[PDB]
Amino acid sequence: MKVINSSRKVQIPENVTVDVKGRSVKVTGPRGTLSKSFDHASVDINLVGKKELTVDLWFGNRKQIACIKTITSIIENMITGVTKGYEYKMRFVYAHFPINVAVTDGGRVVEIRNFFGEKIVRRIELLDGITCYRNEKAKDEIVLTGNSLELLSQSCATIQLRSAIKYKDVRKFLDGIYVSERNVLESN
Amino acid sequence: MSKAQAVGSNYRVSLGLPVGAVMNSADNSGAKNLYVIAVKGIKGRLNRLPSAGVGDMVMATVKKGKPELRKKVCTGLVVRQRKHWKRKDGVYIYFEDNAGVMCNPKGEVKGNILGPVAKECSDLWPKVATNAGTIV
Amino acid sequence: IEPSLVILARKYKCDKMICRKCYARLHPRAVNCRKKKCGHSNNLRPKKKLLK
Amino acid sequence: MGRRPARCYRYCKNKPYIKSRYCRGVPDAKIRIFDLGRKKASTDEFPLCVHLISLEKEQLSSEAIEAGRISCNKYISKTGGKDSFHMRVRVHPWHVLRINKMLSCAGADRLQTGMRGAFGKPMGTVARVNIGQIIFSIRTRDNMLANVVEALRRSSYKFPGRQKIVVSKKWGFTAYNREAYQKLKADGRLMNDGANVKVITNHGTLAQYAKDIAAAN
RNA sequence: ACCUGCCGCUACCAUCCGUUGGAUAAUGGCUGAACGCCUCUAAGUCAGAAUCCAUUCUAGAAAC
RNA sequence: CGCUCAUAGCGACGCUGCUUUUUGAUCCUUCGAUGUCGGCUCUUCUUAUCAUUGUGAAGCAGAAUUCACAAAGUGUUGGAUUGUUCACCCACUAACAAGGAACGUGAGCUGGGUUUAGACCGUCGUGAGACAGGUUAGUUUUACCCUACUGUUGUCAAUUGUU
RNA sequence: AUUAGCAGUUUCGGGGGCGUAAUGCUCUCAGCUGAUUCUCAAACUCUGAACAUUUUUGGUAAGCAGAACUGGCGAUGUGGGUUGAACCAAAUAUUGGGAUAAGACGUCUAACAUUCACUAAUAGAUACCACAAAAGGUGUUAGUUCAUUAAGACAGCAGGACGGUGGCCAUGGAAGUCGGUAUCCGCUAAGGAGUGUGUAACAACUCACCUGCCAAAUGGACUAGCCCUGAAAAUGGAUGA
Numbered sequence A: 001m002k003v004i005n006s007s008r009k010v011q012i013p014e015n016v017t018v019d020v021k022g023r024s025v026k027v028t029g030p031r032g033t034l035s036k037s038f039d040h041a042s043v044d045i046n047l048v049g050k051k052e053l054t055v056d057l058w059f060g061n062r063k064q065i066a067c068i069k070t071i072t073s074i075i076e077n078m079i080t081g082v083t084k085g086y087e088y089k090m091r092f093v094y095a096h097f098p099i100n101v102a103v104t105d106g107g108r109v110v111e112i113r114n115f116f117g118e119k120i121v122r123r124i125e126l127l128d129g130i131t132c133y134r135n136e137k138a139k140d141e142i143v144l145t146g147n148s149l150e151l152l153s154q155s156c157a158t159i160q161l162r163s164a165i166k167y168k169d170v171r172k173f174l175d176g177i178y179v180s181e182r183n184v185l186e187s188n
Numbered sequence B: 001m002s003k004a005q006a007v008g009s010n011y012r013v014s015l016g017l018p019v020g021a022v023m024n025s026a027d028n029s030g031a032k033n034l035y036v037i038a039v040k041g042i043k044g045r046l047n048r049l050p051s052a053g054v055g056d057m058v059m060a061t062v063k064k065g066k067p068e069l070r071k072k073v074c075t076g077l078v079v080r081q082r083k084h085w086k087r088k089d090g091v092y093i094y095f096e097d098n099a100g101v102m103c104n105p106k107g108e109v110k111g112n113i114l115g116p117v118a119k120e121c122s123d124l125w126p127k128v129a130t131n132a133g134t135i136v
Numbered sequence C: 001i002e003p004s005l006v007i008l009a010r011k012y013k014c015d016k017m018i019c020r021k022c023y024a025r026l027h028p029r030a031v032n033c034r035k036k037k038c039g040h041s042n043n044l045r046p047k048k049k050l051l052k
Numbered sequence D: 001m002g003r004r005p006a007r008c009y010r011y012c013k014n015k016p017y018i019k020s021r022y023c024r025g026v027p028d029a030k031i032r033i034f035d036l037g038r039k040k041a042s043t044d045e046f047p048l049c050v051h052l053i054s055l056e057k058e059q060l061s062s063e064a065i066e067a068g069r070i071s072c073n074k075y076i077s078k079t080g081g082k083d084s085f086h087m088r089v090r091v092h093p094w095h096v097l098r099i100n101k102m103l104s105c106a107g108a109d110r111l112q113t114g115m116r117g118a119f120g121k122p123m124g125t126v127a128r129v130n131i132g133q134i135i136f137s138i139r140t141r142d143n144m145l146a147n148v149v150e151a152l153r154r155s156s157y158k159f160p161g162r163q164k165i166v167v168s169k170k171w172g173f174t175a176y177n178r179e180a181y182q183k184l185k186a187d188g189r190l191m192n193d194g195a196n197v198k199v200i201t202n203h204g205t206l207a208q209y210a211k212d213i214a215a216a217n
Numbered sequence E: 001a002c003c004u005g006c007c008g009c010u011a012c013c014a015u016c017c018g019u020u021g022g023a024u025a026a027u028g029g030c031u032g033a034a035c036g037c038c039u040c041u042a043a044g045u046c047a048g049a050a051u052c053c054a055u056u057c058u059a060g061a062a063a064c
Numbered sequence F: 001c002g003c004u005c006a007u008a009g010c011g012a013c014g015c016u017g018c019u020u021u022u023u024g025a026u027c028c029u030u031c032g033a034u035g036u037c038g039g040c041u042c043u044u045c046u047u048a049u050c051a052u053u054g055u056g057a058a059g060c061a062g063a064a065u066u067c068a069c070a071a072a073g074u075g076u077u078g079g080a081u082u083g084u085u086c087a088c089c090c091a092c093u094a095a096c097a098a099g100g101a102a103c104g105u106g107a108g109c110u111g112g113g114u115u116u117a118g119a120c121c122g123u124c125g126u127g128a129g130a131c132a133g134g135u136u137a138g139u140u141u142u143a144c145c146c147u148a149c150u151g152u153u154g155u156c157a158a159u160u161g162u163u
Numbered sequence G: 001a002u003u004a005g006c007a008g009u010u011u012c013g014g015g016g017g018c019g020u021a022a023u024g025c026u027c028u029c030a031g032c033u034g035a036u037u038c039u040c041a042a043a044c045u046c047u048g049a050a051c052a053u054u055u056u057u058g059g060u061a062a063g064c065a066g067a068a069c070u071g072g073c074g075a076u077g078u079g080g081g082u083u084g085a086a087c088c089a090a091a092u093a094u095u096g097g098g099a100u101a102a103g104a105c106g107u108c109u110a111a112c113a114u115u116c117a118c119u120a121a122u123a124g125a126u127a128c129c130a131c132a133a134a135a136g137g138u139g140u141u142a143g144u145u146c147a148u149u150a151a152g153a154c155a156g157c158a159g160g161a162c163g164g165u166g167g168c169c170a171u172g173g174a175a176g177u178c179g180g181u182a183u184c185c186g187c188u189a190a191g192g193a194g195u196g197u198g199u200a201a202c203a204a205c206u207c208a209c210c211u212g213c214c215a216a217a218u219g220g221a222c223u224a225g226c227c228c229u230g231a232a233a234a235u236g237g238a239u240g241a
Helices: A062-083 A149-162 B119-124 B126-130 C002-012 D062-072 D146-157 D180-187
Strands: A008-011 A017-020 A024-028 A033-037 A052-055 A086-093 A101-104 A109-112 A122-125 A142-146 A176-185 B022-024 B033-039 B057-061 B074-080 B099-102 D049-054 D059-061 D095-099 D121-128 D134-139 D163-168
Touching: A008 A062, A024 A062, A033 A062, A052 A062, A062 A086, A062 A149, A086 A149, A086 C002, A122 A149, A142 A149, A149 A176, A176 C002, B022 B099, B033 B099, B057 B099, B074 B119, B119 B126, D049 D146, D059 D062, D062 D121, D062 D134, D062 D146, D134 D146, D146 D163
Parallel strands: none
Antiparallel strands: A008 A052, A017 A024, A024 A033, A086 A142, A086 A176, A101 A109, A109 A122, B022 B033, B033 B057, B057 B074, B074 B099, D049 D134, D049 D163, D059 D121, D095 D121
């Protein structure tokens, strides 16, 4: 009926900092100052020491408690990002009409020229805080690195979606951009 | 059917008459008349004849001609509309009397086209252009 | 490469489970339609596989 | 049914009309066969019982009954061997449904053979039940039970209303549980008659087991 | 009566003209719990219809 | 059934439904009379979406289909035959999908039918006469009222300065 | 009316190996008779019940038609059910104060506080009464059963997942796995002549099966409360707003 919730928590090492002034948090580290907001299902959170961070909740549902974990997870992810960047190494595939993707960083946009004979550009603006390099082996692989897991990943997904055909079979063309390795973290 | 226009459709529709109008065959094949059933591409609306082409393909019949060619529908090609039109040009082509030819369903005219043929029609249907020495 | 990439491609599209109501491609080890209109059916074909 | 969709013969009403010396156009029931499996199989050899029972008083059609039986017919190789199978239904469609027909089917207005003398020819033969009366029964060995309940499950769809499946504590088609139905064999006061049982007669019989001994064989 | 016939009115029987933003649906995702995994979802959110609502357009309130 | 394979696509036997676009059952309202049927005309409406757009399936290689959803924004034809819807062919087409709205619409129509008087034929009837039997000819009246609507004057007398 | 086997039989019906067909043995059929069971009968009973509601007949059903008892609109409205011939409250002389009735008590609209759970749904909200079903749901709430677990679990990930042996078949081949059958043992904590993927077929991987770590709960199966799916029709739209 009411089954009583409790606090999960997250550990913050001594190359990174955290503020939280009004149930909204900005973790900071060597990469940058990555931010995400909370308080929205009456979700109470408080910092105890420069080492722990805790999200307290002791009166609610299963539903309420579900939120608590998620928030914690998100903050952990953010922390990780701030320590060292989330990497999304995609790989594309075609050589009948070789898939040709180009980019600008700073403006942070990716554009797809040739794609299943598409003579258009498919420009897609990446969110802020996403870089893109590419040690290509045989006209394959783009990488997108970024700090906020949540945003970089989203951007990647968008890109993937853009490299897709909406008509005819999917076992016909097995081509487009495809994320080979997500949840990857560079060695610092 | 067929269909191949053009580039463009050589602009607007004009007719001599819609459905139920005789025009001569203008053809070495022994069709002597061509009477319209309807016109191709006419999608049409409530109460409105399927109206004659400027140089476009029609569902037609040999009403008075060879008995072999008589009965049985036939895709044709309008060649000259008695009733007039302006072109993207500022001229008003107008003719003696309506005329066309019986044709193949890839547009192709059978023998040789008799008399004068509006240039639009020729442009539309390359076979027509080929098979005549009058394209005015 | 092409085998290592085709598999990947399949994973993102062809090897997920459809519904027998909404036909909605869930995910490779799915168990309910996850829709309101369906009523999370719990009836799930795996989406077909072909060599052509 | 054929002339009707069973929505007008869903619920019990009117007193019972039957295949009688008053009716006669009464059709033959859709099943006159009610058992499925080894009928030679003993009372003792099978000790497992599941029932099917309605929760609401409703008139099950003979066709419906037939359909139900021929789920459990086909759920038998799936079960595993017809040898380890009994069935009996235990609801025979005795009662008959009336149909005054509407003579107009493509056109033509009566008001002459309309609703005057409009008494049903009997078409439809059907069985009544209540809020727990049995509508299928299965004796079997203790091997098949998740099989038989699945057959019943199929049967459940082939019947109107909310049914129910209960496993009896008896040996199947017997008024003794198991606690009792070992003591009969164990003490050895049982008497057998094929698919049924009898039991020796002390509080069963007395005036004819007064000066008698053939009544302890 | 007939042939011309102006201004005028008019014939896809002539001519010229009929746009672009956010909001969503289905649906495809993203992070992501409930349910150590896993999941388009519960918290949160990305794309996205002839749709929605605006922009443009007609009238202009006992409205200013 | 579907090579294989219950549910891609179907789906026997059986059960539950919706619907008021069939017709019957009915006779509650109208016989001191709601003008009966059809077709032309025209709006608006419902979705059970035929096309369209955006999508998801497939036994989807492609084209071509088939199935599902969102979705009624926009489109949904010309004839021959029949009093005619219904019907039944030809013809184009993106598609020629279903319907409703006093079986939408007779002071909007013609009246083709049906429903009177005249007649003809058949059948039935001793006959007068009958016939969801055919056939042929057979006055569609009234708005100058109230409203609703189209467009137009006038008012905006507390839309505050004689405007 | 009507299902089921069981028993004693049947040179008194019939056919098989034996025997004269056999009814004798060993099998099935037919008929009789004896002991049991299934379901049961408005026009049956050994036995027996103190327009509204309840009973009931016909009807697919209807705001259809038709009966019984009683209650209701007739010289009978009022208060209530949003509104209303039949439901309730309850009977109508003309008045005042009081206190109740049915029914309400956010606002409409006289009439509030408290306290606990449930729902998160374009939901749901005053019997009659203006609709909803079967069947679905890893929505949430409650609950019942049995099982797993300190011999250390679940979920997860990490490791191992062998031999006789290519068992016999079919079969160049199909070796656990086109397909079929029998489906046995050795060694081990541990491993089915094997759940799938896959391979021409073997393999490889994955499962069953066993251990590492984390460290305490876990798994199924139903049951019923609310919510959802089902759940489409015609002017705009009604828990009365």
